[PDB]
RNA sequence: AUGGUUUGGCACCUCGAUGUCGGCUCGUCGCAUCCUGGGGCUGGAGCAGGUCCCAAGGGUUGGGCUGUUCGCCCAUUAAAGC
RNA sequence: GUGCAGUCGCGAAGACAACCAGGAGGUUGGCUUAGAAGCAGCCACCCUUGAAAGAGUGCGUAAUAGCUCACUGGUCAAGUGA
């Protein structure tokens, strides 16, 4: 991963996020690619599921209001963008979480605010 | 086993081993080459054993160029003979090699196999040699 | 292709000869001479490390702007003398050139691409002749071999050259030759 | 170096006495003595820990630094926790029963073998085919555990003999 | 778990379908007949199988789409693929044949749309040297 | 334990070390284990 | 490449003399080890091997044939070393 | 093994070792053979989910199974490779 590649990865993540209404932070340690592929299938219809480096997102977060998620990057980082709709992936990630239980939703971000595990679960229902 | 088809004189003085090579010091045909570093008569068989060694490792692809040709004969008197009574009959053909001379040149797609193959050829030559590529 | 001259500092030589030149090399300086259309041979000593650095980056045909005792002269590396074993630079010939002058020099050729699987690519000629303006000299030329099949000869005339560049060498030179890959039956035959 | 550049934490119950290059540590499990090399200076931080320092950066100081630090941590850990090496025996008719401070092995020899416990080491047998050896010195614990391991020649075919619990021994197949 | 490919018209015990799963300790006679019923409903192509086994030696088998190489071989009419791919080419294939195979593989592939599935079959066709058109 | 003037890392797990001024090769596989002498 | 024992090359000491092959008697030294002693690896299950490393303390048979060294053969032996 | 010097690669966008997780679908790629499934051998050496997964660096199996690795992300905290 060259320095130019590291920089352009920030730009694409920022470009992806800018049109993304909300973000969800989740933990993926211990999930096979096949099951991850089903989550990609459960999310790729409308949303976008990604895993990126902690500091790569950090620089890709200083632009917009995801500067407030710096404390949610401690540990494995899996981020879900919702370019289509708002809560569609929120149900899917919780349902996938209940299916595997090796996944922990670290937190979420929507409309300029950061929320905890219970709160994003509340917005998952709403 | 390379020998000249015919030679004007069959018994010759021993080629002298002084100096360093003036011509043929740079790889011209292939992409890698073996450069000598010490003076020694590279005989007829050593070339054959080395050339076979290159072909075995590179298998199918690639081409090998042998810039050294053994056309200088060497003689030996028949075994169990006192000295005198003329010069012995020619026995083996050698090619005089000076430091800087490029013996073999090998062309192959990937570098790693090509360098390994040329390394095996070096172990079949009496001289200390090094592998040299084409660019500066 | 317009390139910026490389700056070097050169000083004249008090004593010339194999005694002095050997000592100068031992000091890390490479003796050189400078002649040109001005008809004025000058004996200079360049620093070996910086001269090596210029050549490594800008190729063997590097355009120079020497500083000979406070005077700036534009010079071109006509030729070099590399010891066969030590691979040093024993001596360099520098030719003065004015901007806008046609100079005939040799540039290298690189083959870039991916040949067909059943193909061995052979480069017969390393360098080709070129006439170009002193500052418009290309550092190297490229030849592309992708999807080429059978025995196809890429001759000198087929190469594409930058604007203002002429092919002094005749086009008939066969710079690149592509042939069918030899088989183990063919390898164990030649040389016997 | 990196190992030597890490201060040695001393828990509250552990006493540390320094006399120049001589070091002695006293704790609940017993008393130990150590000496450090000339190039390294050993001093005590007022926090209650151990710090080792090397003056220069040649082989001797760099190599001795990592050793000297990790020698103390083993010294301090021995007098607070101690070291217990767990073993287990494989084979048919292979028995172990303890006699006093000595340990006896029935390894299929025509006679039974007996091992005496030196000072500062104790043997505690749990089952006939599983036991343990405990002591203060990591080297002495590992040393006697080595000698016990040499009682029977390695057996790649059936695996009979003494073993460590986590040990994985290679096995081949005796067919013909 | 164990992976095997068994021809549609036969389910006899064989060293490929014997000690391969016999060493795991699973019943064989039941497996041959149950697989036979499904593969003779198809009756057409050799069907890969993946036997999923639990700790109680109970086994659940997975029956998926036929191999792409065998699908392409039968879609081309040739019996054996090219032994020298991309230099000597046995047969020619059309896009509609590729797409129907890709649609067949779509239930077995990790692709998203038919276009991605078609390229996957195109990659498989290149593997044994079947030119695509 | 092969004793040869030339010792090389036969396999990838093989490690080249030096004990008491003599070069060895230590590997998990005992066949690969050799020593310069 | 080692060794200098084999067949040679050289002709330097000895032709106003350095007795030359086998056998006997008597030894002494080297280790490039035949047995005995200690190990590694084995396509080492056990018995028995194969190869390599260390080791020179002791031991290393009697006969048929030939002037024989050498060799083949008969009986043993832990071994019938160079 | 070490002393000196010079290039080049990576590195606080946390380099290297270690520790945690993942290392996939087509697929047992074609030919080849009893077999040959990434791991006798030959040909090509792709596409897809994607962070990253090679027509697979090794071990293991008759062939599968299995252990791995290449490679990716997480903790760590200044250097680490040729």
mmCIF file of C-alpha atoms in Angstrom, chain A residues 9-117:
data_model
loop_
_atom_site.group_PDB
_atom_site.id
_atom_site.type_symbol
_atom_site.label_atom_id
_atom_site.label_comp_id
_atom_site.label_asym_id
_atom_site.label_seq_id
_atom_site.Cartn_x
_atom_site.Cartn_y
_atom_site.Cartn_z
ATOM 1 C CA UNK A 9 -8.228 5.339 -0.226
ATOM 2 C CA UNK A 10 -9.099 8.217 2.107
ATOM 3 C CA UNK A 11 -10.632 10.162 -0.780
ATOM 4 C CA UNK A 12 -12.821 7.275 -1.956
ATOM 5 C CA UNK A 13 -13.990 6.530 1.591
ATOM 6 C CA UNK A 14 -14.736 10.229 2.063
ATOM 7 C CA UNK A 15 -16.466 10.370 -1.329
ATOM 8 C CA UNK A 16 -18.488 7.286 -0.390
ATOM 9 C CA UNK A 17 -19.376 8.714 3.025
ATOM 10 C CA UNK A 18 -20.330 12.215 1.855
ATOM 11 C CA UNK A 19 -23.321 10.852 -0.073
ATOM 12 C CA UNK A 20 -23.939 8.304 2.711
ATOM 13 C CA UNK A 21 -26.716 9.424 5.045
ATOM 14 C CA UNK A 22 -25.503 7.524 8.116
ATOM 15 C CA UNK A 23 -22.743 5.208 9.309
ATOM 16 C CA UNK A 24 -22.647 2.208 11.650
ATOM 17 C CA UNK A 25 -19.533 0.965 13.473
ATOM 18 C CA UNK A 26 -19.322 -2.791 14.066
ATOM 19 C CA UNK A 27 -16.782 -5.437 15.101
ATOM 20 C CA UNK A 28 -16.054 -8.428 12.859
ATOM 21 C CA UNK A 29 -13.296 -10.421 14.606
ATOM 22 C CA UNK A 30 -14.122 -14.074 13.980
ATOM 23 C CA UNK A 31 -16.360 -14.015 10.899
ATOM 24 C CA UNK A 32 -15.653 -16.158 7.852
ATOM 25 C CA UNK A 33 -15.717 -14.665 4.359
ATOM 26 C CA UNK A 34 -18.645 -16.861 3.304
ATOM 27 C CA UNK A 35 -20.781 -15.592 6.186
ATOM 28 C CA UNK A 36 -19.342 -12.133 5.550
ATOM 29 C CA UNK A 37 -20.421 -12.611 1.931
ATOM 30 C CA UNK A 38 -23.981 -13.299 3.101
ATOM 31 C CA UNK A 39 -23.816 -10.048 5.066
ATOM 32 C CA UNK A 40 -22.551 -8.447 1.862
ATOM 33 C CA UNK A 41 -25.570 -10.061 0.195
ATOM 34 C CA UNK A 42 -27.795 -8.906 3.061
ATOM 35 C CA UNK A 43 -26.361 -5.380 2.752
ATOM 36 C CA UNK A 44 -25.167 -4.957 -0.843
ATOM 37 C CA UNK A 45 -28.694 -4.727 -2.240
ATOM 38 C CA UNK A 46 -29.107 -1.206 -0.820
ATOM 39 C CA UNK A 47 -26.370 -0.397 1.711
ATOM 40 C CA UNK A 48 -22.570 -0.659 1.628
ATOM 41 C CA UNK A 49 -20.510 -2.774 4.035
ATOM 42 C CA UNK A 50 -16.795 -2.095 4.485
ATOM 43 C CA UNK A 51 -13.850 -2.765 6.777
ATOM 44 C CA UNK A 52 -11.129 -0.120 6.707
ATOM 45 C CA UNK A 53 -8.046 0.804 8.691
ATOM 46 C CA UNK A 54 -8.633 2.809 11.864
ATOM 47 C CA UNK A 55 -6.415 5.768 10.966
ATOM 48 C CA UNK A 56 -7.361 5.556 7.284
ATOM 49 C CA UNK A 57 -10.948 6.373 8.275
ATOM 50 C CA UNK A 58 -9.681 8.939 10.803
ATOM 51 C CA UNK A 59 -8.166 11.086 8.058
ATOM 52 C CA UNK A 60 -11.207 10.211 5.945
ATOM 53 C CA UNK A 61 -13.332 11.608 8.802
ATOM 54 C CA UNK A 62 -11.846 15.049 9.488
ATOM 55 C CA UNK A 63 -13.694 16.559 6.519
ATOM 56 C CA UNK A 64 -17.324 16.088 7.566
ATOM 57 C CA UNK A 65 -18.885 15.533 10.976
ATOM 58 C CA UNK A 66 -17.433 12.072 11.547
ATOM 59 C CA UNK A 67 -14.580 13.675 13.461
ATOM 60 C CA UNK A 68 -16.665 12.695 16.510
ATOM 61 C CA UNK A 69 -16.145 8.969 15.910
ATOM 62 C CA UNK A 70 -12.418 8.915 16.752
ATOM 63 C CA UNK A 71 -13.162 7.037 19.980
ATOM 64 C CA UNK A 72 -15.050 4.283 18.106
ATOM 65 C CA UNK A 73 -11.968 3.125 16.153
ATOM 66 C CA UNK A 74 -10.356 1.203 19.044
ATOM 67 C CA UNK A 75 -10.321 -2.411 17.904
ATOM 68 C CA UNK A 76 -11.553 -4.011 14.679
ATOM 69 C CA UNK A 77 -13.497 -1.553 12.536
ATOM 70 C CA UNK A 78 -16.381 -2.510 10.255
ATOM 71 C CA UNK A 79 -18.375 0.400 8.842
ATOM 72 C CA UNK A 80 -21.766 0.254 7.113
ATOM 73 C CA UNK A 81 -22.836 3.069 4.791
ATOM 74 C CA UNK A 82 -26.488 3.619 3.908
ATOM 75 C CA UNK A 83 -26.608 5.330 0.517
ATOM 76 C CA UNK A 84 -30.141 4.039 -0.056
ATOM 77 C CA UNK A 85 -32.688 4.696 2.693
ATOM 78 C CA UNK A 86 -31.711 5.282 6.332
ATOM 79 C CA UNK A 87 -32.678 2.382 8.624
ATOM 80 C CA UNK A 88 -32.588 -0.459 6.061
ATOM 81 C CA UNK A 89 -29.133 -1.660 7.087
ATOM 82 C CA UNK A 90 -29.873 -0.931 10.756
ATOM 83 C CA UNK A 91 -32.307 -3.844 10.845
ATOM 84 C CA UNK A 92 -30.014 -6.025 8.724
ATOM 85 C CA UNK A 93 -26.908 -5.492 10.864
ATOM 86 C CA UNK A 94 -28.856 -6.246 14.045
ATOM 87 C CA UNK A 95 -30.365 -9.358 12.453
ATOM 88 C CA UNK A 96 -26.919 -10.444 11.261
ATOM 89 C CA UNK A 97 -25.609 -9.690 14.750
ATOM 90 C CA UNK A 98 -28.257 -11.962 16.265
ATOM 91 C CA UNK A 99 -27.441 -14.688 13.733
ATOM 92 C CA UNK A 100 -23.693 -14.766 14.423
ATOM 93 C CA UNK A 101 -23.250 -13.184 17.900
ATOM 94 C CA UNK A 102 -19.535 -12.806 17.109
ATOM 95 C CA UNK A 103 -20.395 -9.304 15.855
ATOM 96 C CA UNK A 104 -20.610 -6.306 18.191
ATOM 97 C CA UNK A 105 -22.009 -2.976 16.990
ATOM 98 C CA UNK A 106 -19.506 -0.486 18.402
ATOM 99 C CA UNK A 107 -21.623 2.538 17.556
ATOM 100 C CA UNK A 108 -23.264 4.605 14.870
ATOM 101 C CA UNK A 109 -23.462 8.080 13.408
ATOM 102 C CA UNK A 110 -26.438 9.833 11.845
ATOM 103 C CA UNK A 111 -27.428 13.419 11.013
ATOM 104 C CA UNK A 112 -24.352 14.849 12.727
ATOM 105 C CA UNK A 113 -24.671 12.895 15.994
ATOM 106 C CA UNK A 114 -22.944 9.869 17.520
ATOM 107 C CA UNK A 115 -24.921 7.213 19.395
ATOM 108 C CA UNK A 116 -24.232 4.162 21.550
ATOM 109 C CA UNK A 117 -25.213 0.517 21.039
#
